[PDB]
Symmetry: C4
Subunit: 457 residues, 4 copies
Amino acid sequence: LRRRLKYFFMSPCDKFRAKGRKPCKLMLQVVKILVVTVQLILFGLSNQLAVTFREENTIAFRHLFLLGYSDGADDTFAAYTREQLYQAIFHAVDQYLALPDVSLGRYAYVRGGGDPWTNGSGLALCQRYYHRGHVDPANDTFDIDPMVVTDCIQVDPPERSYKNLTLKFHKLVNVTIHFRLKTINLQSLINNEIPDCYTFSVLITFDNKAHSGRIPISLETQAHIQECKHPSVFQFRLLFDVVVILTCSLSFLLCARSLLRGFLLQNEFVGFMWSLWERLEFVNGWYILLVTSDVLTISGTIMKIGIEAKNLASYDVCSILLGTSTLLVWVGVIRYLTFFHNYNILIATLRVALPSVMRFCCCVAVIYLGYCFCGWIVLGPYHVKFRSLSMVSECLFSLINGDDMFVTFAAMQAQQGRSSLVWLFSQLYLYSFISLFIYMVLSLFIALITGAYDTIK
Amino acid sequence: LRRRLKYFFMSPCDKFRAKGRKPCKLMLQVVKILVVTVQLILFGLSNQLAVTFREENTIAFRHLFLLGYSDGADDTFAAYTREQLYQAIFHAVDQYLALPDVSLGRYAYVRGGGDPWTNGSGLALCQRYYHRGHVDPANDTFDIDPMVVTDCIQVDPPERSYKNLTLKFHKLVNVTIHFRLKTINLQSLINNEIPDCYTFSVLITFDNKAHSGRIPISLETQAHIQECKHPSVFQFRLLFDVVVILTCSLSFLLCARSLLRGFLLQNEFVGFMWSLWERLEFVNGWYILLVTSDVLTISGTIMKIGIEAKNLASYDVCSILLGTSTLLVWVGVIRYLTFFHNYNILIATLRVALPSVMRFCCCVAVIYLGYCFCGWIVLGPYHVKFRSLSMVSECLFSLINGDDMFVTFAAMQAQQGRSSLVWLFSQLYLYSFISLFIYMVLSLFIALITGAYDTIK
Amino acid sequence: LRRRLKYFFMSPCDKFRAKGRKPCKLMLQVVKILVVTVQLILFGLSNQLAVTFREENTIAFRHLFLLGYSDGADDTFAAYTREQLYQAIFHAVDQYLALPDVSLGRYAYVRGGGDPWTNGSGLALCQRYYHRGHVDPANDTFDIDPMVVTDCIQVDPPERSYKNLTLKFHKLVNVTIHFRLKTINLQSLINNEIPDCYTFSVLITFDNKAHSGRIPISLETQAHIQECKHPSVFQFRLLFDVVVILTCSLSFLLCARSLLRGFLLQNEFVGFMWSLWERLEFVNGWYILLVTSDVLTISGTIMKIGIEAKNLASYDVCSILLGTSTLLVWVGVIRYLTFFHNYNILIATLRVALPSVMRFCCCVAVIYLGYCFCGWIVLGPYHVKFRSLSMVSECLFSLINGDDMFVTFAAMQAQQGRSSLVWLFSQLYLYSFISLFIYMVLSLFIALITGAYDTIK
Amino acid sequence: LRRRLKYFFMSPCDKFRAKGRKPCKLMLQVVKILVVTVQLILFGLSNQLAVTFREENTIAFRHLFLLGYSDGADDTFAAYTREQLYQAIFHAVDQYLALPDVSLGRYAYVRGGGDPWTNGSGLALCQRYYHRGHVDPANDTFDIDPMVVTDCIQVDPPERSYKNLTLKFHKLVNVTIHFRLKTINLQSLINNEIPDCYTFSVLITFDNKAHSGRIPISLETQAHIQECKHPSVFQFRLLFDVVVILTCSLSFLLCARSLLRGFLLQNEFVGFMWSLWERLEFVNGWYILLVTSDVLTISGTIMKIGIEAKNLASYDVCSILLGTSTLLVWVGVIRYLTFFHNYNILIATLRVALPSVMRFCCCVAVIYLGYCFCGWIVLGPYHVKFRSLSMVSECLFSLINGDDMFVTFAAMQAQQGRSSLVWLFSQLYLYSFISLFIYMVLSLFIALITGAYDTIK
Ligand SMILES: CCCCCCCC(=O)OC[C@H](COP(=O)(O)O[C@@H]1[C@H](O)[C@H](OP(=O)(O)O)[C@@H](O)[C@H](OP(=O)(O)O)[C@H]1O)OC(=O)CCCCCCC
Ligand SMILES: CCCCCCCC(=O)OC[C@H](COP(=O)(O)O[C@@H]1[C@H](O)[C@H](OP(=O)(O)O)[C@@H](O)[C@H](OP(=O)(O)O)[C@H]1O)OC(=O)CCCCCCC
Ligand SMILES: CCCCCCCC(=O)OC[C@H](COP(=O)(O)O[C@@H]1[C@H](O)[C@H](OP(=O)(O)O)[C@@H](O)[C@H](OP(=O)(O)O)[C@H]1O)OC(=O)CCCCCCC
Ligand SMILES: CCCCCCCC(=O)OC[C@H](COP(=O)(O)O[C@@H]1[C@H](O)[C@H](OP(=O)(O)O)[C@@H](O)[C@H](OP(=O)(O)O)[C@H]1O)OC(=O)CCCCCCC
Ligand SMILES: C[C@@H]1CC(C)(C)N(C(=O)CN2C(=O)c3ccccc3C2=O)c2ccccc21
């Protein structure tokens, strides 16, 4: 029995020289790395095509429909006078009507199809305001019914009015322009793929929710991919996907067999004992990782086949699945380096250090979260790097690693002459956080890790 | 007696299993964390509304009143010819007079109300120059009485001259335009709050104090919030604030009772001894922190209630109080992790290391301050990162942490061809500071911290 | 025999006091450092002249031929309407025809010389489209023969039509403008060199391969250097090159003699032994480095002489050879510091640490490569820092060293509102990579290096 | 005798309790810190005034005389057509002639005064070209006499032609415009100082030395300060300078007396011995530092008095002297912390570590210099961060500290498609340098420093 357990925990070379076992799993792992990486790159080709089409069309729409737009001005593009706003709205509508004559792309109009478009209408120009608004700052008084009323003007695409629009400025909530355009992604021909039919839903927003005299203007698009009706293009990916599936399936079967054998050996040993952690010694975590990677790879390959068959269009989900599977396949090869001490430093140190590291992180995390919330709420209105909770976490994590420090300090230097108390608070906040986390938290973290390494040295 | 002292220093679980004590303070701490964080976020909503209103109105004013203004040009916006300055001034006044017809916001005029406006005057256009100025650079001579004379033209808002302004360029100190606008912060309705009435005091400055042929132009605003006169809006925060106050009060009472018990036990022990540091062993600093946090939270909640009641408008003070209280509430939960060694590494190391760290910082601080002053005065006129003492401290602290180094070096590369001696001095200054502080000071600092950790390992 | 081996491993001073040997190699090394560095700088003069000529001419071409071009707009310069594209094309052609009257430089036209220019034609204006293209997005259908058809209009340079161009927009692949200009690099006279004759091949591309309504416009140049036909300029570099060659040749001969002596001593010792690593003890790696440096220096000097003689024009290859040789010459002087322990810390630590460091890097590299591939494919379409594999490696290597962290996080903040799943994946990817590599991999790497140092301490 | 030496090495408190000695030097040091810092700030006021005047006048000149100039365009401002160059030159001359009517500043003209101005001429417009230039790129030939010929047109300032200029474009070396303007720095009145008279020498350069079709345009100024002739301004710095001088003189005398006493004690001890390093134990380096600081402070104060007296105008030299003296005064206070071990960690570690650190730097410096030269010559023409040797050193030093890594990599990504060999070389160069210096050099440096600290722990 003892020899059986000794063989169970033996390296591939030792196992071979003991029982002449062929190391099929190692060669399978190498082949998997190669084929999975190649498949990921091949998929990335089509993913890039789709993304490029969407973003390039969006940029073209911004240049076509936004009056006076230039690249890099997205977050400051705004109107400041009634005349500017009217001109921008009319420019957008006029460009929509003139698209077939001026645009470099080939677009088709879409009519009807539910709200906000009536039947036969291509463009909806809607203004939303308050049901009752009387604003008299001269008398410091107002009378408001905040229920929002929407008034929409319908414009039919030209056959191959909106100029009377009167905006209720003092109670205006916003103005929106909605329309849809159909186009074809011809560039797919370069990848020997049949072009898809795209529908872009375009929304242009003139936002007055702040009632501050400045109305920002933005353009957004939603892309819907569809198979074209009986297209025609004059005159091995499926087989490669099948090969990937076969390799992953064989690897999954072998790993499952190994896991079952380990479970049976664990049962036999426990029986021969006439605990839990001692039972986990028989569970190969690397093989759990391998089977998870195989499942992810097979699911991603099926999704990729479906997308190429035009049954699906979830490019992002497929990309995430395949990329995660590729990373896991690359990582899984360390299972065989684990057998040799000189090549196993990282894994051994991680194993020894994880408990204390997690316990330390438990205590550090509450301080981190307190700082996150405090900065988010107090400094967010004044600091571009504290606008949202996730952004605050990113900024603080970067500061812990010594990145982007002076710019973080400098962003607040504008408030020194206007909101001095907030500036002083920001000084204390930033100095205390940086000192505490760089000099105390990180030092102890590295000390724990290096002491764990010293243990297994 | 000894058993009493032993119990006094026992963990919540040990205390429970000894005397069946319910750990009310721990549950109170958890509830406090939750409710205080929620309160901070809820307050942040209104804080953001107010700040957004102020800044957006200021940006709109800059676009409305500054001729040729564009975003991002604030620190270089200037006039360079007499005609440009006259056009800018007249544009500002004309836009002030045309505001009701062109602005997207709804503004009301303010008249009189003391200097610099006379009764019935909405806008004050003032030029300040020298009482006697005769400047003859051709003869290298001048005759100056530096007493400043102010001449103001009053403009009444239009009923629903300044064009004869003659600037004394050779002795002109500056030109200012002052006016006030009233508006209403309608966006508050989205938060189910009654809109406030804002008065913006707008100051436009054309600054010629340098007499250098370049006159920078700036716009600044001061916002005053007030309750509107009998407003009308058609059809649980107070209760949540009350709940926060109740939780904080109960926590304060429990902590005070614990502190009193500790003080009584300290007195009894000293009496049984038939020093100072030995007495401080009976003072729970965590409970001092907790009572301070409770006081801050209660004060912030009272201020927030007052602001919501429109009795106050000090948003920044309330935000600082509540954010600091939230951070302290999050930190205070470590008092219970302190009882377990594996989770107490950070606090124990801090306790052991603070004295030596402070002694080391004492010596390092004088070198830091010498560098700060030297850089501020020598390099400040030439380096954008050394303009002020606080900016110098920020730059040097970032350099200590390895941040923003090459840009700091590059800012001086422009003076290599013009002021070479200053450039060489900057080379020596920067190299010496970086080497000394990164390689010697920081190494010893981390060594002290890690040795202290080794002591408590 | 033992004394012979002892003397073989003796330092230059010890060798001199033993046998009165003159340390010629050390003096040769110092002289080599001096002369090789001087030669590198002297070559850099001409290299800079050539590179400046090319780049400045390219910038001038961009300003001359691209309608509305401005500096810094290269990667966003594009057309968005049919009229803009026609105007840009016609502007390029008209400027090509008007060059002799408007350009600040002096250029000559080139005619014929093969495709795409016919005989006597200076400019080729070609449009490439699909052989058959019928695109009907209204009916969601198309009929495409993707064979590319090129149609070219030839323009002869003016004697000292293209306006009828009709673009097939719906099936247009791209438009190109090809022409060549001849000029003379007169600035070489400042270096006392005869000016060369340059031919610039200019390609202007209007790219429509994405069919997205946005057509980027770019200009590229290829420079061909040639000797001018019998030029005339009115009224020691070769000798310095000869001196460098002589010094390197003598150093090479001495190093080869030393290596032969070491090999013979190794043979004698092995014979007196009546393994491999023991044999390598007799091989001076520093002398292998020195002979390699001598070969590189001699080859670079020959190439430099040929370039100055106008027989060659491979400035980049010569620069790389000479710079690498200079670096190796500077490095080789450490061979003599190696004899003294206090000055040999770095080399001794490297010797002791290299095996373990390489073994560690073996395991770390697979994780690094998995991350590289995953990021390249998943995030490349959305992140400017992940566009290519080399860019991904640069970004990840910078992140390992704590550089450019917050900007990497912020680049993805735009996808939070639009592609949230990809944003969440990017969050996990970046956080996991940074934590794992900064806190675990780097800590162990430094620990291995410092332990190796402790061994030789 | 032994007691005398024991007293010689005794702390101020111990010395006082032994012989009742008053610690005058310590109080003098504190007073020196205060007064020297205050003096530095007071001087910085005037230094800032002067620097601001110069820079603001230069910016105003750029906006006045450069056609189409805008802020931030200095390094790309250039002309690209003959018409643009003619318009820029004529605009500069016309603005010079129209200055009295358009400028916001008040300037006086300067006539004659030697080359390049003839008697009575205010502006010199010179073109420099080749004596003989025949350039025929069509025939690939030229005939050049590179002797430079200058032709100058003189323009007299308007009483309160150059339009016939014909540029020889094909052999033009450059065009320059020279003129001088006199003005008065009135802002000094705010500091209660008499305004100085400034003469600005303005040089505008249109540079064609590259003959590349692009002519960059630049403006530079030289400022000369002078005392105005009998100025008149209607109705304690000297005393503070005297106080600083008195304090520094007393400190210098006390330090010199202490040094003499130490020297005499050293002589007596050596005599009682009936080496060098043992003699250096009697030399107080802190007092050498103090006397050097006193000399610097006194010289700076004298120079400052002279500048305020208008006998000198060397603001930069005075600022450097005073700032260095302030830094040294702040540093010198550590002499008294040196007596206590807990506060003497830094100095003791530096003393123990300096020899080994210097020996290590000796070996590292040759590698650093090899990299510097190689990068400067090979990558300088292609990389904005490698243009000059000092800039290369700054970039490499920043990279050693992990700063600005990704941007350094990205600057070369433009050459990947054009000069691929140089790009690959840059890849190898940057990766090798960063790895070697961050992971090996710095680790050993910190290890040496921390081992030295461990010695004195
Ligand atoms: C009698 C029990 C029930 C029936 C079992 C039948 C099994 C059968 O036939 O093959 C098993 C091997 C396993 O191949 P593979 O998994 O590479 O090899 C096994 C593992 O090394 C395992 O250790 P771990 O890797 O640590 O889990 C070890 O215990 C097994 O020896 P042991 O059996 O003495 O315990 C090995 O056989 O499979 C192939 O080597 C590829 C076959 C396909 C080749 C063509 C591919 C296109
Ligand atoms: C006889 C002396 C004078 C009268 C004293 C009357 C006291 C009374 O009644 O309760 C005290 C407890 C304290 O609750 P709490 O503070 O959670 O618990 C105490 C602490 O654990 C204290 O240690 P530290 O935490 O280290 O300071 C410990 O010494 C006390 O035991 P000891 O008394 O044997 O010394 C505990 O009672 O209060 C509640 O547990 C919540 C009550 C409100 C529940 C409803 C809330 C809505
Ligand atoms: C008898 C054997 C065959 C014939 C050999 C004839 C050799 C001859 O003549 O000179 C050799 C020396 C070598 O000069 P150099 O290489 O500087 O010096 C030798 C090295 O130090 C070598 O050790 P490593 O440096 O560790 O390899 C050492 O073993 C040799 O001693 P050893 O001979 O007792 O073993 C030295 O002679 O050359 C000159 O010092 C410059 C001559 C040119 C001066 C003018 C320049 C313009
Ligand atoms: C007999 C020898 C020749 C005549 C010497 C006459 C000297 C005289 O009169 O004063 C000396 C002291 C020195 O003052 P000060 O330098 O502060 O004090 C001396 C130092 O502490 C010195 O040690 P280090 O600091 O380590 O070098 C120590 O050896 C001397 O004692 P010792 O003499 O027993 O060796 C001290 O007198 O001066 C004042 O304390 C300020 C006087 C001005 C006060 C007004 C200022 C406005
Ligand atoms: C927190 C910081 C730690 C350490 C880096 C050791 N340090 C200095 O090196 C010098 N130093 C200052 O004196 C200072 C004042 C204000 C802001 C920043 C700094 C600063 O960095 C130091 C010294 C004293 C107190 C704290 C510290």
